[PDB]
A paper describes a structure:
Likely bacterial candidates include the inclusion membrane proteins (Incs), a group of proteins that are unique to Chlamydiales and that are translocated from the bacteria through the Type III secretion system (T3SS) and inserted into the inclusion membrane. Retromer is composed of two distinct sub-complexes of tightly assembled subunits: a cargo recognition trimer (VPS26/29/35) and a membrane deforming heterodimer made up of sorting nexin (SNX) SNX1 or SNX2 paired with either SNX5 or SNX6. The individual SNX1/2/5/6 proteins encode a Phox-homology (PX) domain that recognizes and binds to specific phosphoinositides on membranes and a Bin-amphiphysin-Rvs (BAR) domain that both senses and induces membrane curvature. We recently discovered that C. trachomatis IncE binds directly to the PX domains of SNX5/6 but not SNX1/2 and that IncE is sufficient to disrupt retromer-dependent trafficking of CI-MPR.
To uncover the molecular basis for the strong interaction between IncE and SNX5 and to illuminate the biological function of this interaction, we determined the crystal structure of the Mus musculus SNX5-PX domain (SNX5-PX20-180) bound to the C-terminal 25 amino acids of IncE (IncE108-132). The structure contained four copies of the SNX5-PX:IncE complex in the asymmetric unit, which are all less than 0.41 Å RMSD between the molecules and do not appear different in conformation. The final model of the complex (Rwork/Rfree 20.32/26.00) showed that IncE108-132 forms a β-hairpin that does not appear to be externally stabilized by its interaction with the PX domain. In the SNX5-PX20-180:IncE108-132 structure, the SNX5-PX20-180 β-sheet is completed by the IncE108-132 β-hairpin, which binds on the surface of the α-helical hairpin in the hydrophobic groove, hydrogen bonding with the SNX5-PX20-180 β-sheet to form a hybrid, five-stranded antiparallel β-sheet. In particular, SNX5Y132:IncEV114 and SNX5F136:IncEF116 form stable van der Waals and π-π stacking interactions that appear to be central to the specificity of the interaction. In the SNX5-PX20-180:IncE108-132 crystal structure, we observed no direct interaction between IncE108-132 and the previously observed PIP binding pocket. The changes between the apo-SNX5-PX structure and the IncE108-132 bound SNX5-PX20-180 structure are small and consist mainly of an inward rotation of the SNX5 α-helical hairpin ~30° toward the IncE peptide.
Residue numbers in the entry:
A (entry chain P): 111 to 131
B (entry chain A): 29 to 178
The structure:
Amino acid sequence: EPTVQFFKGKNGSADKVILVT
Amino acid sequence: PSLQIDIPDALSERDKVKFTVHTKTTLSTFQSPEFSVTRQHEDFVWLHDTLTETTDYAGLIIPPAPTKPDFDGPREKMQKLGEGEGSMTKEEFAKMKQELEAEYLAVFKKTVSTHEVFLQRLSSHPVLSKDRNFHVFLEYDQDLSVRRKN
Protein backbone atom coordinates (compact mmCIF):
# COMPACT_ATOMS: atom_id res chain seq x y z
CA GLU A 1 0.00 0.00 0.00
CA PRO A 2 2.61 2.64 0.88
CA THR A 3 5.21 3.88 -1.59
CA VAL A 4 8.99 4.11 -1.34
CA GLN A 5 10.62 7.19 -2.84
CA PHE A 6 14.25 7.38 -3.99
CA PHE A 7 16.42 10.48 -4.38
CA LYS A 8 19.78 10.73 -6.13
CA GLY A 9 22.37 12.55 -4.05
CA LYS A 10 23.69 15.83 -5.44
CA ASN A 11 26.68 17.99 -4.44
CA GLY A 12 28.32 15.02 -2.73
CA SER A 13 25.23 14.12 -0.73
CA ALA A 14 24.31 10.45 -0.34
CA ASP A 15 21.44 8.85 -2.24
CA LYS A 16 18.53 7.96 0.03
CA VAL A 17 15.04 6.49 0.19
CA ILE A 18 11.91 7.68 1.98
CA LEU A 19 9.01 5.57 3.20
CA VAL A 20 5.98 7.66 2.25
CA THR A 21 3.04 8.00 4.64
CA PRO B 1 26.44 17.66 -24.90
CA SER B 2 23.49 18.70 -27.01
CA LEU B 3 21.30 15.93 -25.53
CA GLN B 4 21.82 15.10 -21.83
CA ILE B 5 19.67 12.85 -19.76
CA ASP B 6 19.59 11.84 -16.16
CA ILE B 7 17.37 10.31 -13.52
CA PRO B 8 17.26 12.48 -10.38
CA ASP B 9 14.69 10.35 -8.53
CA ALA B 10 12.61 7.17 -8.56
CA LEU B 11 9.59 5.70 -6.90
CA SER B 12 8.28 2.26 -5.97
CA GLU B 13 4.56 2.06 -5.70
CA ARG B 14 2.81 -1.24 -5.37
CA ASP B 15 4.24 -3.27 -8.21
CA LYS B 16 5.19 -0.38 -10.42
CA VAL B 17 8.44 1.55 -10.46
CA LYS B 18 8.38 5.12 -11.74
CA PHE B 19 11.45 6.99 -12.97
CA THR B 20 11.81 10.74 -13.41
CA VAL B 21 13.48 11.23 -16.79
CA HIS B 22 15.18 14.63 -16.89
CA THR B 23 16.51 16.03 -20.17
CA LYS B 24 18.66 19.06 -20.94
CA THR B 25 19.10 19.82 -24.63
CA THR B 26 20.26 22.57 -26.98
CA LEU B 27 18.54 20.95 -29.95
CA SER B 28 15.57 22.88 -31.32
CA THR B 29 14.17 19.52 -32.46
CA PHE B 30 12.74 19.42 -28.94
CA GLN B 31 10.07 21.96 -27.96
CA SER B 32 11.84 22.93 -24.72
CA PRO B 33 15.50 23.31 -23.66
CA GLU B 34 14.77 21.52 -20.37
CA PHE B 35 11.98 19.14 -19.38
CA SER B 36 11.03 16.13 -17.25
CA VAL B 37 8.59 13.24 -17.61
CA THR B 38 7.50 10.20 -15.61
CA ARG B 39 8.27 6.75 -17.02
CA GLN B 40 7.58 3.27 -15.69
CA HIS B 41 9.92 0.34 -16.31
CA GLU B 42 7.45 -0.92 -18.93
CA ASP B 43 8.08 2.25 -20.95
CA PHE B 44 11.80 1.50 -21.07
CA VAL B 45 11.03 -2.02 -22.26
CA TRP B 46 8.65 -0.65 -24.88
CA LEU B 47 11.25 1.85 -26.09
CA HIS B 48 13.89 -0.84 -26.56
CA ASP B 49 11.59 -3.33 -28.28
CA THR B 50 10.23 -0.61 -30.56
CA LEU B 51 13.76 0.24 -31.68
CA THR B 52 14.72 -3.39 -32.28
CA GLU B 53 11.55 -4.11 -34.27
CA THR B 54 12.23 -1.15 -36.55
CA THR B 55 13.50 -2.95 -39.66
CA ASP B 56 15.74 -0.03 -40.65
CA TYR B 57 17.48 -0.30 -37.27
CA ALA B 58 18.16 -4.03 -37.60
CA GLY B 59 21.93 -4.38 -37.37
CA LEU B 60 22.54 -1.23 -35.34
CA ILE B 61 24.35 -1.54 -32.03
CA ILE B 62 21.27 -1.13 -29.85
CA PRO B 63 22.04 -0.89 -26.12
CA PRO B 64 20.41 -3.66 -24.04
CA ALA B 65 17.13 -2.96 -22.26
CA PRO B 66 17.39 -2.40 -18.50
CA THR B 67 16.19 -5.42 -16.51
CA LYS B 68 13.11 -5.28 -14.28
CA PRO B 69 13.97 -4.02 -10.78
CA ASP B 70 13.15 -6.54 -8.05
CA PHE B 71 11.25 -4.95 -5.17
CA ASP B 72 9.22 -8.07 -4.30
CA GLY B 73 11.50 -8.91 -1.38
CA PRO B 74 11.63 -5.43 0.23
CA ARG B 75 7.91 -4.84 -0.43
CA GLU B 76 6.97 -8.01 1.46
CA LYS B 77 9.27 -7.17 4.37
CA MET B 78 8.00 -3.59 4.54
CA GLN B 79 4.30 -4.39 4.68
CA LYS B 80 4.76 -7.22 7.15
CA LEU B 81 6.92 -4.82 9.09
CA GLY B 82 4.01 -2.49 9.14
CA GLU B 83 1.49 -4.91 10.67
CA GLY B 84 3.64 -5.54 13.69
CA GLU B 85 3.97 -1.86 14.58
CA GLY B 86 1.57 -2.08 17.49
CA SER B 87 3.01 -5.37 18.66
CA MET B 88 6.59 -4.50 17.92
CA THR B 89 8.67 -2.57 20.39
CA LYS B 90 9.32 1.05 19.54
CA GLU B 91 13.03 0.34 19.59
CA GLU B 92 13.53 -2.37 17.00
CA PHE B 93 10.84 -1.08 14.67
CA ALA B 94 13.26 1.66 13.59
CA LYS B 95 16.02 -0.98 13.70
CA MET B 96 14.78 -3.14 10.82
CA LYS B 97 12.96 -0.26 9.13
CA GLN B 98 16.36 1.35 8.67
CA GLU B 99 17.57 -2.06 7.50
CA LEU B 100 14.60 -2.19 5.13
CA GLU B 101 15.35 1.28 3.78
CA ALA B 102 18.92 0.15 3.17
CA GLU B 103 17.53 -2.80 1.22
CA TYR B 104 15.42 -0.49 -0.93
CA LEU B 105 18.41 1.81 -1.38
CA ALA B 106 20.58 -1.01 -2.74
CA VAL B 107 17.96 -1.97 -5.33
CA PHE B 108 17.21 1.63 -6.33
CA LYS B 109 20.84 2.68 -6.92
CA LYS B 110 21.37 -0.33 -9.16
CA THR B 111 18.19 -0.07 -11.24
CA VAL B 112 18.41 3.71 -11.61
CA SER B 113 21.93 3.24 -12.94
CA THR B 114 20.89 0.63 -15.52
CA HIS B 115 17.94 2.73 -16.70
CA GLU B 116 19.96 5.96 -16.91
CA VAL B 117 22.86 4.38 -18.82
CA PHE B 118 20.34 2.90 -21.26
CA LEU B 119 19.01 6.37 -22.10
CA GLN B 120 22.44 8.00 -22.15
CA ARG B 121 23.69 5.40 -24.63
CA LEU B 122 20.67 6.14 -26.83
CA SER B 123 21.38 9.88 -26.74
CA SER B 124 24.93 9.44 -28.03
CA HIS B 125 23.85 7.23 -30.94
CA PRO B 126 23.73 9.24 -34.21
CA VAL B 127 20.72 7.31 -35.55
CA LEU B 128 18.79 6.23 -32.46
CA SER B 129 18.88 9.65 -30.75
CA LYS B 130 16.79 11.07 -33.60
CA ASP B 131 14.15 8.34 -33.41
CA ARG B 132 10.53 9.48 -33.15
CA ASN B 133 9.68 7.07 -30.33
CA PHE B 134 12.79 8.03 -28.36
CA HIS B 135 11.60 11.62 -28.72
CA VAL B 136 8.15 10.69 -27.38
CA PHE B 137 9.69 8.78 -24.47
CA LEU B 138 11.57 11.88 -23.31
CA GLU B 139 9.05 14.61 -24.10
CA TYR B 140 5.48 13.29 -24.06
CA ASP B 141 3.88 14.57 -20.85
CA GLN B 142 0.99 12.12 -20.47
CA ASP B 143 1.11 8.40 -19.67
CA LEU B 144 2.45 6.11 -22.41
CA SER B 145 -0.16 3.44 -21.61
CA VAL B 146 -2.40 4.25 -24.59
CA ARG B 147 0.44 4.58 -27.11
CA ARG B 148 1.76 1.22 -25.89
CA LYS B 149 -1.61 -0.40 -26.61
CA ASN B 150 -2.34 0.95 -30.10
